[PDB]
Design a binder for this molecule. Structure first.
Ligand SMILES: COc1cccc(OC)c1CN1CCC(NC(=O)CCCS)CC1
Length: 370
């Protein structure tokens, strides 16, 4: 409790391609690299020789595999993945020293799911059963882990922007953050849903209705790269970012993500870009705290940079942009999410990412969409 040296630096990845952990499935253990995703609830792995894959789940080689005789089809905006459901012995080599029987979706057909040149072969859905496919009766991995072992109902993520990080399963590592942890309530157990109560652009309020910041929902999602903002909020935020950075010239398609902006090595103007503070609902009535991100977080290197704030039709998504500045504690036991300044985040001598509180905010319940 507090250390967990085995789990430090157990995450790897490429910028914009997500963070993956090493896992084993079946017996004898079949090693796979698995994308860590707090925005979904299915443990799904490649099970067929797709050309993009380094390796895949071979059920015939596993003596402990049990077929569920059920299929799962998961469509989305770009493509899909389809798989066959079963259960097997699942373990995390650089995690807790345990082995559990968990549900595995063996992917047999996919479109625009696997990435050409990537080093991961599956996805670990760490969200709740409510958004699991085909339905809520299929138990997610972490629910199975807690139920079958003495591992506490908690995990934390330190994502550092080759890219790396740490997933601490069953606890918190105090070396991975500086200062204090600040907790925001999980509004509902489906996605990791939170409530944003105020937004500042360089210490300046957007003066919008706080219900707009959570239009539909607001979520913490390690599977999304960008900081996704509601259309009305995005429009207001970019306008304030445009005005704050008027010293340098940028094309119109850049803010929409249709074009990149490039600068000479070491000549990237950070100071011209504003900081972004998100005020989150606190644990106490009328009490809030704020998390502040640097341009280092929302300007993602592709020195060519992409604008990593995008308009969304599904609510606020606090992706890797937000998460890379902070140590994030998914305290499932107490239905809350902790934020603290990451010990590994990208910062300069001028400005640093911050978690500050407490603040006074009234009518925070009105910010949640119904
Ligand atoms: C199965 O989905 C895919 C498909 C291709 C790549 C991929 O890995 C980045 C995933 C995994 N992951 C699922 C959950 C998704 N998150 C959301 O639905 C919230 C945003 C809407 S407001 C993010 C993507």
């Amino acid at each position: 409790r507090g250390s967990f040296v085995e789990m430090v630096d157990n995450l790897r990845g490429k910028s914009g391609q997500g963070y993956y952990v090493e896992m084993t499935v079946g017996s004898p253990p079949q090693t796979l690299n698995i994308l860590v995703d707090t925005g979904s609830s299915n443990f799904a792995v490649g099970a067929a020789p797709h050309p993009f894959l380094h390796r895949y789940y071979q059920r015939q080689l596993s003596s402990t595999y049990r077929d569920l005789r059920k299929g799962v089809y998961v469509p989305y905006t770009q493509g899909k993945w389809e798989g066959e459901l079963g259960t097997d012995l699942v373990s995390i080599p650089h995690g807790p020293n345990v082995t559990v029987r968990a549900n595995i979706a063996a992917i047999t057909e996919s479109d625009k799911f696997f990435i050409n040149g990537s080093n991961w072969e599956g996805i670990l859905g760490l969200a709740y059963a409510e958004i699991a496919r085909p339905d809520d009766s299929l138990e997610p991995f972490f629910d199975s882990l807690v139920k079958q072992t003495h591992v506490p109902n908690l995990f934390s993520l330190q994502l550092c922007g080759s890219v790396g990080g740490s997933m601490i399963i069953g606890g918190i590592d105090h070396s991975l953050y500086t200062g204090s942890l600040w907790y925001t309530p999980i509004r509902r157990e489906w996605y990791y849903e939170v409530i944003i109560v105020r937004v500042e652009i360089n210490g300046q309020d957007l003066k919008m209705d706080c219900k707009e910041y959570n239009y539909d929902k607001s979520i913490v999602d390690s599977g999304t790269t960008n900081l996704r903002l509601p259309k009305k909020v995005f429009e207001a935020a970019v306008k304030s970012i445009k005005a704050a950075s008027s010293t340098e010239k940028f094309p119109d398609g850049f803010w929409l993500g249709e074009q990149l902006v490039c600068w000479q090595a070491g000549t990237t103007p950070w100071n011209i870009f504003p900081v972004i503070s998100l005020y989150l609902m606190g644990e106490v009535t009328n009490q809030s705290f704020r998390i502040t991100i640097l341009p280092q977080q929302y300007l993602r290197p592709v020195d060519c940079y992409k604008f990593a704030i995008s308009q969304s039709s599904c609510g606020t998504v606090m992706g890797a942009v937000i998460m890379e500045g902070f140590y994030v504690v998914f305290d499932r036991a107490r239905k809350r999410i902790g934020f603290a300044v990451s010990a590994c985040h990208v910062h300069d001598e001028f400005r640093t990412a911050a978690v500050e509180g407490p603040f006074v905010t009234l009518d925070m319940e009105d910010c949640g969409y119904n």
